[PDB]
């Protein structure tokens, strides 16, 4: 899909 989401995931795990 050429119009699939190309951006990073802002809700990925940010903790240690």
């Amino acid at each position, epitope marked *: 899909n050429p119009n699939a989401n190309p951006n*990073a*995931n*802002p*809700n990925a*795990n*940010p*903790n*240690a």
Partner: antibody, heavy 120, light 109 residues
């Protein structure tokens, strides 16, 4: 756990302001930290998140390119550099601790908040 | 970004009632959803996360339900301490976090 925001006040439009949040009784380097603001309309809106080691920074669409989130683990403090402030930025700004779970971006602890008024 | 809308905006109830408020999302958020309670002049308090997991310390009269696009917060028996404003919040993967506009629970008379 304790969070205390500081740096708020009145700032003219277009100018800058740096907020700070001091975390105590918590291993600060272990958690991601957010900034959440609340407009006079009482609407909540997520502003930014920084990873536990500053490895990544993500921003709300409305502040991308004007706000900068950063952290100093050696001082247990969260920073938020706000540039080119508009009237739409007038709000209470809370720092919030990420819960720590891998799949849940939720805020278990908040600071009291700090008010930023953008006004001439 | 995902739009969170809460129904109703204000809800009148009396102590002891069974109250349910709803949160509908523009698109599916799976179960990446949380509920907060907020009283005037104070920061929000976490109630529910992952759609239905009760946060430790929250009274058991609170419970969350829902999947995909429609969600509910239920208070089994309303206490005088629960009159406040309740917000939903999604954290669906690859979507910037959004809050609902809130639902105010008000005393009936």
């Amino acid at each position: 756990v304790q969070l205390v925001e500081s740096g708020g006040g009145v700032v003219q439009p277009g100018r800058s302001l740096r907020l700070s949040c001091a975390a105590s009784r918590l291993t600060f380097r272990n958690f991601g930290m957010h900034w959440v603001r609340q407009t006079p309309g009482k609407g909540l809106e997520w502003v930014a998140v920084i990873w536990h080691d500053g490895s990544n920074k993500f921003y709300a669409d409305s502040v991308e390119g004007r706000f900068t989130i950063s952290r100093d683990n050696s001082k247990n403090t969260l920073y938020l550099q706000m540039n080119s402030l508009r009237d739409e930025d007038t709000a209470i700004y809370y720092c919030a601790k990420d819960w720590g779970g891998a799949s849940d971006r939720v805020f278990d602890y908040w600071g009291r908040g700090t008010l930023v008024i953008v006004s001439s | 970004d995902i739009q969170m809308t809460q129904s109703p905006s204000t809800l009148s109830a009396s102590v002891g009632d069974r109250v349910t408020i709803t949160c509908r999302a523009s698109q599916s958020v799976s179960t990446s959803l949380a509920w907060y309670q907020q009283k005037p002049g104070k920061a929000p308090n976490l109630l529910i996360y992952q759609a239905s997991t009760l946060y430790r310390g929250v009274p058991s009269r609170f419970s969350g339900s829902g999947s995909g696009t429609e969600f509910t917060l239920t208070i089994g028996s309303l206490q005088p301490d629960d009159f406040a404003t309740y917000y939903c919040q999604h954290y669906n993967s690859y979507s910037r976090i959004t809050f609902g506009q809130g639902t105010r629970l008000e005393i009936k008379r």
